[PDB]
Design a protein around this ligand. Structure first.
Ligand SMILES: NC[C@@H]1O[C@H](O[C@H]2[C@@H](O)[C@H](O[C@@H]3[C@@H](O)[C@H](N)C[C@H](N)[C@H]3O[C@H]3O[C@H](CO)[C@@H](O)[C@H](O)[C@H]3N)O[C@@H]2CO)[C@H](N)[C@@H](O)[C@@H]1O
Ligand SMILES: NC[C@@H]1O[C@H](O[C@H]2[C@@H](O)[C@H](O[C@@H]3[C@@H](O)[C@H](N)C[C@H](N)[C@H]3O[C@H]3O[C@H](CO)[C@@H](O)[C@H](O)[C@H]3N)O[C@@H]2CO)[C@H](N)[C@@H](O)[C@@H]1O
Ligand SMILES: NC[C@@H]1O[C@H](O[C@H]2[C@@H](O)[C@H](O[C@@H]3[C@@H](O)[C@H](N)C[C@H](N)[C@H]3O[C@H]3O[C@H](CO)[C@@H](O)[C@H](O)[C@H]3N)O[C@@H]2CO)[C@H](N)[C@@H](O)[C@@H]1O
Ligand SMILES: NC[C@@H]1O[C@H](O[C@H]2[C@@H](O)[C@H](O[C@@H]3[C@@H](O)[C@H](N)C[C@H](N)[C@H]3O[C@H]3O[C@H](CO)[C@@H](O)[C@H](O)[C@H]3N)O[C@@H]2CO)[C@H](N)[C@@H](O)[C@@H]1O
Ligand SMILES: NC[C@@H]1O[C@H](O[C@H]2[C@@H](O)[C@H](O[C@@H]3[C@@H](O)[C@H](N)C[C@H](N)[C@H]3O[C@H]3O[C@H](CO)[C@@H](O)[C@H](O)[C@H]3N)O[C@@H]2CO)[C@H](N)[C@@H](O)[C@@H]1O
Ligand SMILES: [Mg+2]
Ligand SMILES: [Mg+2]
Ligand SMILES: [Mg+2]
Ligand SMILES: [Mg+2]
Ligand SMILES: [Mg+2]
Ligand SMILES: [Mg+2]
Ligand SMILES: [Mg+2]
Ligand SMILES: [Mg+2]
Ligand SMILES: [Mg+2]
Ligand SMILES: [Mg+2]
Ligand SMILES: [Mg+2]
Ligand SMILES: [Mg+2]
Ligand SMILES: [Mg+2]
Ligand SMILES: [Mg+2]
Ligand SMILES: [Mg+2]
Ligand SMILES: [Mg+2]
Ligand SMILES: [Mg+2]
Ligand SMILES: [Mg+2]
Ligand SMILES: [Mg+2]
Ligand SMILES: [Mg+2]
Ligand SMILES: [Mg+2]
Ligand SMILES: [Mg+2]
Ligand SMILES: [Mg+2]
Ligand SMILES: [Mg+2]
Ligand SMILES: [Mg+2]
Ligand SMILES: [Mg+2]
Ligand SMILES: [Mg+2]
Ligand SMILES: [Mg+2]
Ligand SMILES: [Mg+2]
Ligand SMILES: [Mg+2]
Ligand SMILES: [Mg+2]
Ligand SMILES: [Mg+2]
Ligand SMILES: [Mg+2]
Ligand SMILES: [Mg+2]
Ligand SMILES: [Mg+2]
Ligand SMILES: [Mg+2]
Ligand SMILES: [Mg+2]
Ligand SMILES: [Mg+2]
Ligand SMILES: [Mg+2]
Ligand SMILES: [Mg+2]
Ligand SMILES: [Mg+2]
Ligand SMILES: [Mg+2]
Ligand SMILES: [Mg+2]
Ligand SMILES: [Mg+2]
Ligand SMILES: [Mg+2]
Ligand SMILES: [Mg+2]
Ligand SMILES: [Mg+2]
Ligand SMILES: [Mg+2]
Ligand SMILES: [Mg+2]
Ligand SMILES: [Mg+2]
Ligand SMILES: [Mg+2]
Ligand SMILES: [Mg+2]
Ligand SMILES: [Mg+2]
Ligand SMILES: [Mg+2]
Ligand SMILES: [Mg+2]
Ligand SMILES: [Mg+2]
Ligand SMILES: [Mg+2]
Ligand SMILES: [Mg+2]
Ligand SMILES: [Mg+2]
Ligand SMILES: [Mg+2]
Ligand SMILES: [Mg+2]
Ligand SMILES: [Mg+2]
Ligand SMILES: [Mg+2]
Ligand SMILES: [Mg+2]
Ligand SMILES: [Mg+2]
Ligand SMILES: [Mg+2]
Ligand SMILES: [Mg+2]
Ligand SMILES: [Mg+2]
Ligand SMILES: [Mg+2]
Ligand SMILES: [Mg+2]
Ligand SMILES: [Mg+2]
Ligand SMILES: [Mg+2]
Ligand SMILES: [Mg+2]
Ligand SMILES: [Mg+2]
Ligand SMILES: [Mg+2]
Ligand SMILES: [Mg+2]
Ligand SMILES: [Mg+2]
Ligand SMILES: [Mg+2]
Ligand SMILES: [Mg+2]
Ligand SMILES: [Mg+2]
Ligand SMILES: [Mg+2]
Ligand SMILES: [Mg+2]
Ligand SMILES: [Mg+2]
Ligand SMILES: [Mg+2]
Ligand SMILES: [Mg+2]
Ligand SMILES: [Mg+2]
Ligand SMILES: [Mg+2]
Ligand SMILES: [Mg+2]
Ligand SMILES: [Mg+2]
Ligand SMILES: [Mg+2]
Ligand SMILES: [Mg+2]
Ligand SMILES: [Mg+2]
Ligand SMILES: [Mg+2]
Ligand SMILES: [Mg+2]
Ligand SMILES: [Mg+2]
Ligand SMILES: [Mg+2]
Ligand SMILES: [Mg+2]
Ligand SMILES: [Mg+2]
Ligand SMILES: [Mg+2]
Ligand SMILES: [Mg+2]
Ligand SMILES: [Mg+2]
Ligand SMILES: [Mg+2]
Ligand SMILES: [Mg+2]
Ligand SMILES: [Mg+2]
Lengths: 260, 146, 188
RNA sequence: GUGAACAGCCUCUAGUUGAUAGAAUAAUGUAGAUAAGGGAAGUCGGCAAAAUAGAUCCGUAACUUCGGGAUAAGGAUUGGC
RNA sequence: CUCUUAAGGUAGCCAAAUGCCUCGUCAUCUAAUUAGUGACGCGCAUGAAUGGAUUAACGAGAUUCCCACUGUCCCUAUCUA
RNA sequence: UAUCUGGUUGAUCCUGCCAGUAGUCAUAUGCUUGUCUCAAAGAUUAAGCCAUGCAUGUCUAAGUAUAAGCAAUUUAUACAGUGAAACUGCGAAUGGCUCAUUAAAUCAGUUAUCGUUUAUUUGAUAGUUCCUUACAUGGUAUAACUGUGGUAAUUCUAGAGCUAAUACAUGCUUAAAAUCUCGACCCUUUGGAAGAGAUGUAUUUAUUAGAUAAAAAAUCAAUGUCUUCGGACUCUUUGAUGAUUCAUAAUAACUUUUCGAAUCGCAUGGCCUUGUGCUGGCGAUGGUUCAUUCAAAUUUCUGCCCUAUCAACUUUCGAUGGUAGGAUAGUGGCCUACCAUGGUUUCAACGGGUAACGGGGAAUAAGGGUUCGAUUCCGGAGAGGGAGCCUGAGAAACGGCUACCA
RNA sequence: UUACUUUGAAAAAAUUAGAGUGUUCAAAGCAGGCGUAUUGCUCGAAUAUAUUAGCAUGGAAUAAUAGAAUAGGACG
RNA sequence: ACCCACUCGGCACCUUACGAGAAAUCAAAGUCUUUGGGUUCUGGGGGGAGUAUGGUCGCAAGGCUGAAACUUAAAGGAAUUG
RNA sequence: GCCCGUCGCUAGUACCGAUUGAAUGGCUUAGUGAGGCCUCAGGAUCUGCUUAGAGCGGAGAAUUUGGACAAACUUGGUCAUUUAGAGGAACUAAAAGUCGUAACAAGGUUUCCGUAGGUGAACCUGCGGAAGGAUCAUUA
């Protein structure tokens, strides 16, 4: 249709932004990012619709243009900038930090981590190849390309990544019984460990999973993110820790802490 | 289906960047390039040991099989290096809670390695538009019937 | 402009399909530049997404490779002789791929005699050092040598002159040399 | 010889060169030609004249006693080397 | 029902090469049509081998129109024997 | 949210339709009309025609200011605040509208790119440029502007004279190796050796590696070390894929030789032989390849309504396939050349109709269904009808141009 | 060896169904709720769906399909 | 050849309704709201009408195929009493 | 009683129909062919390299060779959808006209079928059916 599409319509936006039907015809349309705007958080959504710090469209700009926000160590000027999975978002004048991690319903959760643990990030290595001159390279989910990596790292690992500089502080391989966060799907936002990886030649390997409460379920290998060693993530998970409590179970817990 | 010395065309027939040197001498004078299609598909005897060129062959050629892999029975051999397969299937029409018998014909390139005839349930897989209609190459051949 | 679409064609059933939409640039095609011998003239084409194709218009003198020797020198490209697609290109002396042209043999003769030391087809003590080692590899072919007597060699254009702008090729050897020989003599 | 051809046109053999003759070149005739633009307005009536034309390929309607109509109609081609 | 003289125009066809009135009337063709065609028919005076109706193909038969064509015309001029 | 009643007879039971009843995010119309919330609305007839207005423009500290521009009174005598114009930059390909085309087409769900293009965005990537004479930074050219002008008339412009750049055209610049060739002279053996080139990246071709699964001795050319006249042989370099001629590297060349920072803003620090020497801070804009992102292009499988008073269809002149080429961003009869005679069909082709854009959905509420979808979302098409094209990363664009028809 | 059958994955949001919640009721909306109301706490935005095709999976009844007849069969 | 008993396969017939049907009736016209063994053909109020049109077959008469506009509340079946 | 057909009037729908009938759109053979694009050229003007003056390079307007794309005009055909028409010939409505009384009673010649011919009209006759008949019946 003649070129790039510069608009997004409300009701066409990602559901996990939790926008309201009325109030406008349009969503922000995240910028061209490290993350696919399908799965991503525009800064305006985070600040205005989650942190509830900004009340306006014009107000979100007054924050960024006041130099306040950074992301993954670097200041981010862009209103629609698509902060994705495993990001940082430091605000000095508010002293806080947030690592973006999914709910157990699958939305980006508003999750505060301390002045450390916002040092480093994890990312899933999407490909590892040979660059110019023979220089090997590796790139994460968020499009970080890191050069001269560890010969052990293959696709479908994770990498612990210093921010202020870069490169690679150790890593975690992919084999039986590792800690895993589910990137997207029916089971998106869950956490668990590897019961088996069903191999499929010519695409779409099934990855079997078991969580802390001993439930089984499967998703796509491409959505299987290794978050660390079994029972010990490398980052801080929020309440419920991606446990997928049943809808029936939910009702009780709401009417449990509800009383006197 | 008996091919001649295979060098008959107004152009010379050779696989790309396959060079057997005139100065150096081997026992079988010219080299041969074959490959492994994948998906557990045995790349047969005649490919490696044949004289044919067929730039469209799943082995010994420049194509690559990816995507779907389908089956069906050979209907028309009448073409040259391609054939017609007929994949039969039923179709569910819910109003009557019943099936109707449809079918589709797939033009598919066949390597001179394989030998096929009207008959012959045959396994076939999709590699890029090679010609017009044909998106599929013959990768596997079983026998026909009784 | 010319259209590369498949929907101006007929369905494999044979039916003629109505025109569904207009012509769009990305399905276009453009005119052949039929490149013939002559003082170098090469036109730029602004391709898809910017970049450049290079139209060969008049092409003399482009790079050629002697296979077995592993060496490549530049020569004149006299004209065409054979061509598998259209003799019209032969007659008109147009340069495309698969061309089977004729090239200046002399820069290809010079390298040999200044390498193997034997003059082709009939002091500096450091040199006789080298020419001593390189011998016993010094027989080429009866069919590849004889053309040096004439001064022009049988070569096949492997570039796409209207595309790259270079017209390049490789001297014919082996049975490929024989194949086009049995053509030239038993055709013309 | 050209050509489908005992056509028309030119020719070998053979036969003729016979049809009163000289000078001019008005009108009107007889016979032969060509006409700008219009195109049957001429006329009893297109009378006369003009247009068509060989061959190859293509395409060829109603009607019909199914044999025709048909060269229907409509188009393209044509030398030399 | 009558009537002179045996019957009393059936099937068909028509201003027809048969219609006086008559350039019949209606439609069609045309700028305009005593023309043509299609209709209508108490048809002066169509009509059944005195053959009636139809009819493909054929025609130096009679008739109307269309396209092409043209000195037929506007409107005449020039050339040759 | 599993219902029926009225009407054919003298009366009767059936068949059977007509009639009643109810619903409609379904349209019109009539009569009537007070309050809150909510809010469809020239789709249908005619993608018929349209006076006028509006709808696309855009500057940060950070490209270009000598405005006969405003402004204080500038340490501001190169500039410096503000800042029209104009230059360069980017956008104008998004939106919004409409449903006219379109029946395997679009479209849906589902694959493909080991078949390509990609502004931007994010992440990395560059010591090599001259060769035998700016690097304290080459050269002109122009807009705005001023001034002389033409036309009834337009977002028309002529010619005269100035002046800028991240415009246009140019163009130097830096480590240590190491491997290649070629080779003055020394002259015997198992013999050698200065110093003259070549090596960034990209373009083009050719060739080479990109390998291994289980172990042992014989062969030839010349070496590849090495020790003490005895000759020993110690060692094979892969990253990835279901899969490659993949990534990446190697040699020989090729090229109207691509990029390799003559670029701006804030600061004003540190050294010492003090020359305005040498060195330095965070930024902005760029730039080569790569990945990423926003996309694009094609693509696998299966699925459309009425129609046989449409049964054969395609193949001149591409119909189906093979080869070669050409063209494209790239696959492919996309086009050309040559060659074969293929391809679809009663499991309904081909053809015709559609008061047909497809879908998400909507109405109806036993079940099974019937009917509808111009229309808020997605995809598609179009801008009176057709075609052609310039700019561009992206257009076959129409609030762009060119032609024809109307 | 298919057809079939189960489980799953991958399925847009709206819409339908449906949980929750006192928009004063409601149609809706996806808000809200408790407070010390002097620089505060905090649970949400569930859930299930056209069942054709594709993909992965368990099932082997039903119905199909192949297999040694001039043995050119199996096996070491 | 005749008689008798048995048994297939026929053209019918009788009684009973086991059932079925609106009934007349039906050993199928049963095994049907306890609705499915397989399969072929046709019908969807009465007219208009087997008309018009196209096609096709025939020497022709004709056959085969076969509409719509419009019109109408009945038409019809079986049985009952008159 | 019911009841058929012609005939006679009133209104309505469609049909056939001379007009080589009109109209709109799609696909089209032929002829012609704008425009930009590619290409062979051209060279108003302006202009750089090596050496008044000569040799070889770059920039470039009008104009132009050839080519593909190709609107569009003319003339034909084909398919679709709509439509005018003198006249023709049906059918349908409205009722207690005219003619006779075909069918319903053995309807007064049982009715009906296919076919064939004939007749103002319903109908009549021939052949072969059927029973839906006015006969389920002559081992007598
Ligand atoms: N005939 C000799 C050559 O064999 C070649 O093929 C052989 C090997 O070169 C080829 O090797 C593949 C290679 O193709 C591919 N691009 C990369 C891969 N890692 C190699 O190795 C592959 O095969 C080897 C066995 O050979 C396996 O051990 C290995 O797991 C597998 N990845 O696997 C083939 C095994 O028979 C080519 N056909 C051709 O160059 C030539 O014919
Ligand atoms: N059929 C053509 C053949 O060639 C010739 O015929 C050609 C010519 O003689 C003839 O010429 C005629 C001329 O005679 C006649 N009296 C007048 C007419 N205008 C001319 O004809 C020409 O005229 C002009 C061009 O000049 C065009 O407009 C017209 O279409 C054309 N036919 O046109 C003929 C072609 O149509 C010979 N008569 C004969 O060999 C044969 O007829
Ligand atoms: N002009 C004919 C039209 O036919 C239409 O429909 C007709 C047919 O489509 C329909 O079916 C007929 C059937 O009657 C007839 N006796 C048998 C015939 N096979 C069927 O035919 C129909 O179905 C078959 C498949 O069975 C198709 O192959 C055929 O093309 C189709 N016409 O029945 C109708 C004929 O009775 C409508 N009736 C109407 O539009 C009109 O009558
Ligand atoms: N709205 C986001 C999503 O869009 C989707 O849209 C569909 C299409 O856009 C997309 O289609 C293909 C895709 O399969 C494939 N993997 C990539 C391809 N580029 C896409 O196709 C694209 O290009 C084609 C050709 O030019 C266009 O016709 C098409 O509109 C465009 N989307 O595939 C999607 C699923 O079939 C779906 N509607 C749905 O999953 C969801 O709404
Ligand atoms: N809108 C009027 C015209 O439509 C033309 O386009 C027409 C065509 O694209 C298309 O016409 C189709 C045709 O393609 C197809 N092959 C046959 C079909 N019957 C035609 O259909 C057309 O005409 C029929 C009547 O014949 C109408 O019933 C129908 O609504 C109409 N679409 O439909 C359009 C007609 O509406 C042109 N765009 C242009 O000349 C003009 O705008
Ligand atoms: Mg945005
Ligand atoms: Mg998608
Ligand atoms: Mg074959
Ligand atoms: Mg084309
Ligand atoms: Mg002859
Ligand atoms: Mg003669
Ligand atoms: Mg005389
Ligand atoms: Mg005289
Ligand atoms: Mg005279
Ligand atoms: Mg005369
Ligand atoms: Mg003349
Ligand atoms: Mg004249
Ligand atoms: Mg004239
Ligand atoms: Mg004329
Ligand atoms: Mg006349
Ligand atoms: Mg006259
Ligand atoms: Mg007259
Ligand atoms: Mg005459
Ligand atoms: Mg004359
Ligand atoms: Mg013929
Ligand atoms: Mg006939
Ligand atoms: Mg003719
Ligand atoms: Mg005729
Ligand atoms: Mg010729
Ligand atoms: Mg009479
Ligand atoms: Mg008389
Ligand atoms: Mg009579
Ligand atoms: Mg008679
Ligand atoms: Mg008369
Ligand atoms: Mg008359
Ligand atoms: Mg007559
Ligand atoms: Mg007369
Ligand atoms: Mg007349
Ligand atoms: Mg008259
Ligand atoms: Mg008459
Ligand atoms: Mg009369
Ligand atoms: Mg009369
Ligand atoms: Mg009279
Ligand atoms: Mg008489
Ligand atoms: Mg007589
Ligand atoms: Mg008589
Ligand atoms: Mg008479
Ligand atoms: Mg007669
Ligand atoms: Mg005649
Ligand atoms: Mg005549
Ligand atoms: Mg005549
Ligand atoms: Mg005559
Ligand atoms: Mg004349
Ligand atoms: Mg009744
Ligand atoms: Mg009703
Ligand atoms: Mg409208
Ligand atoms: Mg609207
Ligand atoms: Mg748009
Ligand atoms: Mg259509
Ligand atoms: Mg899709
Ligand atoms: Mg200059
Ligand atoms: Mg100027
Ligand atoms: Mg000037
Ligand atoms: Mg390579
Ligand atoms: Mg930057
Ligand atoms: Mg054929
Ligand atoms: Mg064409
Ligand atoms: Mg091909
Ligand atoms: Mg090709
Ligand atoms: Mg291509
Ligand atoms: Mg054929
Ligand atoms: Mg439509
Ligand atoms: Mg619809
Ligand atoms: Mg729609
Ligand atoms: Mg319902
Ligand atoms: Mg229901
Ligand atoms: Mg029901
Ligand atoms: Mg519409
Ligand atoms: Mg509609
Ligand atoms: Mg839309
Ligand atoms: Mg308009
Ligand atoms: Mg630009
Ligand atoms: Mg468009
Ligand atoms: Mg627009
Ligand atoms: Mg346009
Ligand atoms: Mg507009
Ligand atoms: Mg709801
Ligand atoms: Mg069974
Ligand atoms: Mg039921
Ligand atoms: Mg009926
Ligand atoms: Mg009949
Ligand atoms: Mg008929
Ligand atoms: Mg009765
Ligand atoms: Mg009437
Ligand atoms: Mg034409
Ligand atoms: Mg032209
Ligand atoms: Mg009438
Ligand atoms: Mg008539
Ligand atoms: Mg009477
Ligand atoms: Mg009476
Ligand atoms: Mg009677
Ligand atoms: Mg009597
Ligand atoms: Mg009587
Ligand atoms: Mg009586
Ligand atoms: Mg009687
Ligand atoms: Mg009776
Ligand atoms: Mg009689
Ligand atoms: Mg009469
Ligand atoms: Mg009856």
């Amino acid at each position: 249709a003649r070129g790039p599409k510069k608009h997004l319509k409300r009701l066409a936006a990602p559901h996990h932004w939790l926008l309201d039907k009325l109030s406008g015809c349009y969503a922000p349309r995240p910028s061209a990012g490290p993350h696919k705007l399908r799965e991503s958080l525009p800064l305006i959504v985070f600040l205005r619709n989650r942190l509830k710090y900004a009340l306006n469209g014009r107000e979100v700009k007054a924050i960024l243009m006041q130099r306040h926000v950074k992301v993954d160590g670097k200041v981010r000027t862009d209103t629609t900038y698509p902060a994705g999975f495993m990001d940082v978002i430091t605000l000095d004048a508010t002293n806080e930090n947030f690592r973006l991690v999914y709910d157990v319903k699958g939305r980006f959760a508003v999750h505060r981590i301390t002045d450390e643990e916002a040092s480093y990030k994890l990312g899933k290595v999407k490909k590892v190849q040979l660059g110019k001159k023979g220089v090997p390279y590796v790139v994460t989910h968020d499009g970080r390309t890191i050069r001269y990596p560890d010969p052990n790292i293959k696709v479908n690992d994770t990498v612990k990544i210093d921010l202020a500089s870069g490169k690679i502080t150790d890593f975690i391989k992919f084999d039986a019984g590792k800690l895993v966060y589910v990137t997207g799907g029916r089971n998106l936002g869950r956490i668990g460990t590897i019961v088996h990886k069903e191999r499929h030649d010519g695409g779409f390997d099934l990855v079997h999973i078991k969580d802390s409460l001993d439930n089984t379920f499967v998703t796509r290998l491409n959505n299987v993110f290794v978050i660390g060693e079994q029972g010990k993530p490398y980052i801080s998970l929020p309440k419920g820790k991606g446990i997928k409590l049943s809808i029936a179970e939910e009702r009780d817990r709401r009417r449990a802490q509800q009383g006197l | 289906s008996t091919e001649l010395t295979v060098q008959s065309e107004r152009a010379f027939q050779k696989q790309p960047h396959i060079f057997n040197n005139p100065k150096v001498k081997t026992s079988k004078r010219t080299k041969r390039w074959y490959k492994n299609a994948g998906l557990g598909f045995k790349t047969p005897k005649t490919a490696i040991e044949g004289s044919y060129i067929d730039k469209k062959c799943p082995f010994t050629g420049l194509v690559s099989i990816r995507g779907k892999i389908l089956t069906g029975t050979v209907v028309s051999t009448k073409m040259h290096r391609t054939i017609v397969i007929r994949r039969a299937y039923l179709h569910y029409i819910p109003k009557y809670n019943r099936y109707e018998k449809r079918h589709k014909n797939v033009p598919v390139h066949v390597s001179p390695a394989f030998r096929v005839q009207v008959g012959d349930i045959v396994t076939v897989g999709q590699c890029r538009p090679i010609s017009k209609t044909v998106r599929f190459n013959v990768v596997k051949v079983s026998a026909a019937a009784g | 402009g010319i259209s590369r679409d498949s929907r101006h064609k007929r369905s494999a059933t044979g039916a003629k399909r109505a025109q569904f939409r207009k012509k769009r640039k990305f399905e276009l095609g453009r005119q052949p530049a039929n490149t013939k011998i002559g003082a170098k003239r090469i036109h730029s084409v602004r391709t898809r997404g910017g970049n450049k194709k290079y139209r060969a218009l008049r092409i003399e003198t482009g790079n050629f490779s002697w296979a077995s020797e592993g060496i490549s020198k530049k020569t004149r490209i006299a004209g065409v002789v054979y061509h598998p697609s259209n003799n019209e290109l032969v007659r008109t002396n147009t340069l495309t791929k698969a061309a089977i042209v004729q090239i200046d043999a002399t820069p290809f003769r010079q390298w040999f005699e200044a390498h193997y030391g034997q003059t082709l087809g009939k002091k500096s003590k450091n040199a006789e050092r080298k020419w001593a080692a390189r011998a016993a590899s010094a027989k080429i072919e009866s069919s590849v040598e004889s053309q040096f007597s004439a001064g022009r060699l049988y070569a096949c254009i492997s570039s796409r002159p209207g595309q790259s702008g270079r017209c390049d090729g490789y001297i014919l050897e082996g049975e490929e040399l024989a194949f086009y020989l049995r053509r030239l003599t038993a055709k013309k």
